[model samples]
Target: MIERYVEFVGEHEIDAIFKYAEKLKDLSILHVNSTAAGGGVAEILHRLVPLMRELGLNAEWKVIRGSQDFFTVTKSFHNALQTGKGEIPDEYFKIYDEWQEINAGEIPLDYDVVFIHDPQPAGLVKYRKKGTWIWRCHIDISNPHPKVWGFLRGYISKYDGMIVSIPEFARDDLDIPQIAIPPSIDPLSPKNMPLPQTTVDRIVDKFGVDRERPIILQVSRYDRAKDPVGVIESFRLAKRHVPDAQLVYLGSPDPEGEVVYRETVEAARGEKDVHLLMLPPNSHVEVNAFQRAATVVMQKSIKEGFGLTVSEALWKRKPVIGGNTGGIRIQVINGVTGFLVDSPKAAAYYLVYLLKNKKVREEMGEAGRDHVRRNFLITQQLRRYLMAILYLTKRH
Candidate 1:
């Protein structure tokens, strides 16, 4: 498995990684998240856990079970942290507490390092009776709801340390050992790897998108912060410049997002150029094909975590138009890899400008790919994780 990464990271780095991982072969690590599919955390673990096991460690991933109502409230928890609006009802806290207690009990916490992803399973920290505990916050918590932060703080404070994607996101003075481990992309994954041109053309044809027209694609879960509406509005505005500017807004299954999805659908009614698709989990080949087909990829998230999709698109060498907020800023360097925009209007202006200039677009795309190669590959993530393990376990 490490041999597959030789093309990306060279043989010497890969050998060093295997040696380090071998030292920690006796230690076990378990990662807990809300779902086993749909989101980036789950998608990452799907590829990560297997590699850890192959390299001589016990790495497992477990999903916390929740009711529809529980997920509904947790979805609100997600929005409040990013958007800083709406208060979570006290009853929701009770439900969350109850769910966390039951869910934590169901999973044994005997691993050498227990990593909890996001606020969904953060409550697991309080029940930590064994090994090292790490709270991995994969959110744009740079500005979170005070009440919600205070509520979850009680649980988060108990963990041995915490991990966030960016340093700025560790905004609270909670006084814990916080580490910044940005998320990564697996170059070998079917989603990011090279696919046959025939496969790319077939998937694009299946969506009925014209190969000749410039395709502006935004792939995300149906969430407000992702600004699906803003993406469409920008696409509509950009169409005024190039009517054949085909816009594809593809979303995955999200319960809470589905409720707010109606407003987006209502807004997009009567548009023939816009294609809104709600794809299911594990549709990597199709997404891979779409990213390859797109002339430009857009991730206009109003607030974002790391926006792994941007890294995925960049790895495909497609210059991106990312929103100028949260983690997006870290990846989309203006006029270098891509342009960053604050509003839908800003997005339209840049989108139109990039559409008109093909040479600059290709240049930015190449630059973006190089950026991902240096900073956002799975090799980098593995090195960081190994260091984090040595730090947390004091094995060094």
Candidate 2:
């Protein structure tokens, strides 16, 4: 099964990887996060851990359980890191510390390399005596809030190394080695495989969307960072030009996202040509179909952690219009693969331009897929991850 991927990567790269895995073949590696499903980190690990085992390595994934308040507080912390502003209140920090302490006592850490994803499980760094620990921040921390960064800095500084999606996301305060590991998409997954035209027609028809008219789609969680209302207004602005353009606000049920969706739903209440679908995390096929079926895919997130959906859309050969922030920039190379917009008016301007000209969409769509194949596929990430582990255990 693993040999099949040699063509996507290359015989040279794949063979070197097999040798590295052979060396670390006996070492146990673990990934820790806040949720078992939903969000990018969990989703990637879900596919990665199994592949690690398949290639003669020991990889495991664990999720830390927490009370609602702890999660709420952590979400706030997450927002602060991305937006670069917010306070984590003393009590919330206290609860977060206590939870980490408890998890350290309960969760066994027998692995040789332990990767802690995002800020939620970062505090577990105190258990470094248990294994070789590494911290990975998956959000856009280009301008982290001073207070929040100060609080998390203590945990972050203790790691052996840190992993971030983009180089700009690296913090100046951290002295640890920062590894630039961009996120990846699985082309072979259900979300990216080919679907019959009948299937695409069947799904959107059930959603009451008229596929005949061009559709504008935004697929993301309802976190405040995603700016769902902003995307909706952008749709309205573009509608003034391409009056028939329909918008779909589709997202998975992570961090509930419904809270953001509810506000967006209220804003678009009496508005026509906008559809809201709160799909569960397992709705991969539906998302793939939606991305394939849309005339243009819009991911107007104010802040993002490498916005995987942007790559997913681009991978499907769709011109992805996204917010001019975080990893979105890495994918949407303005005027090349796709356009990057900062506000509703700007997003609308680009949306209308592409909608008015079919060739532009086709041109950018072709470029978008090539960019993904060279940079964002799972095999690319798989190759990097193997080297990451090898880098750690090379007799340092």
Candidate 3:
């Protein structure tokens, strides 16, 4: 199963990983997040846990348990982080504290290092034992709500270190050291990498996609930030010129993502020639096939930490049109790899422009692939983790 890692990743990088792990072979690492499946964090852990064990490290993952009401409150906290809405009530804070009390008792508190991911489990710091705790904010915290930020800042201040996607997302007042490590895609994962022709054909047939027409694809969880409705609006505008073009809004169903998905479907009702696919969590091969089959890939997020989907698309040699916010800005190089648009109209215009010129699209696709190869592979992410661990343990 891990053979794909060698085929897609260079031997030198693998050797370096093993060498680094050998130096810190006794350190114990723990990862805590909201769910075991559904979103990118879950997918990353599914692969990362095994790879860490393979590297001879004592790495483990634990999912924090929360009631539906607790999740509802946390979801709002997630939205407020990006929208900068300062209207979160005092009661929400009370609920957050109540949930934390329960989790601190339930979760284990023994490890050399503890990594708390996202706002869902951010409060886990209260239970931190004799270990270095790192808060990993995976969302776009560049423009967070002041009220919520104040609440979270109090909790975040207790952690030993913080990890964000980019420099701009970091808070200046943070007392601990901060690391700007971008997210990555596993080249050998089923959701990425090249697929067999038969597998592609089967996915296309299952999704009822037309191969003759140019396909515009966007793979994201159906959230307001992802702007699935805005994607449909952009596709409608693009259809005026490329009348035969089709838009496929392919996404997987996350347990915590159903509310947003239903809202997106409600907003996209009665639209013609728009395919909204709510795939299962295990549909990695199908997603890989769709992206590989697309003529132009898009991630028109209003706010994003880093759109990993954009990287996945670029890895497959497809030109992308991403939003000009959060980590999406880093993935696209304007005219080099793809364009960054602010609105549906602008995204629609770029879609038609790329469709008209086949030579430009081909050149951009090649450039995009090369860009991902250098900066957005799993090896780079693993390297950062190894270096951070060595630095922290040396001080102790």
lDDT of each: 0.87, 0.85, 0.86
Whole-model lDDT for model 2 versus the true structure? 0.85
RMSD of candidate 1 to the true fold?
A: 1.5
lDDT (Cα, 0-100) at 52 in candidate 2? 84
The TM-score, computed over Cα atoms with residue i paired to residue i, of candidate 1 is 0.97
**Backbone atom clashes (below 3 Å) for every candidate:** 0, 1, 0
Tens-digit per-residue lDDT, 200-290, candidate 2: 9999998999999999999887777889999888988888889888999887653456567788898787678999887767888898889
The digit string of per-residue lDDT tens for model 3 on 1-396 reads 334566656787777888898997998899999999767788778877788898778999989888777887888898899999846778888889888888888888699988899988888787777878888888888888888888899889998888898778998868787888888888888898679888887887788888888999999878878888889888888988998888899986635367777766776676666789988877888899999889999999999989889999989889999999999888999999999999999999999999999999999999998999888888878888788777766654
* Model 2: CA > 4 A from native: 253-259
Steric clash count of candidate 2: 1
| Cα displacement (Å) at residue 275, model 1 | 0.8
> In candidate 1, what are the lDDT values of residues 1-396, reduced to their tens digit?
879898888887788888889778999899999987768898888888898888888888999999988988888899898887896789989999889889978999888899999999998787888788889999988878989888988888888888899888885567878899889999999889899999999888987888888999999977888888888889888899988889888787655577757877877887898888878888999999999999899999988888999999888988899998877888899999888998999899999998999999899999999999988888888878877887888831
Reference-based lDDT, residue 110, model 2: 72
RMSD of each: 1.5, 1.7, 2.1
- For lDDT, the strongest prediction is 1
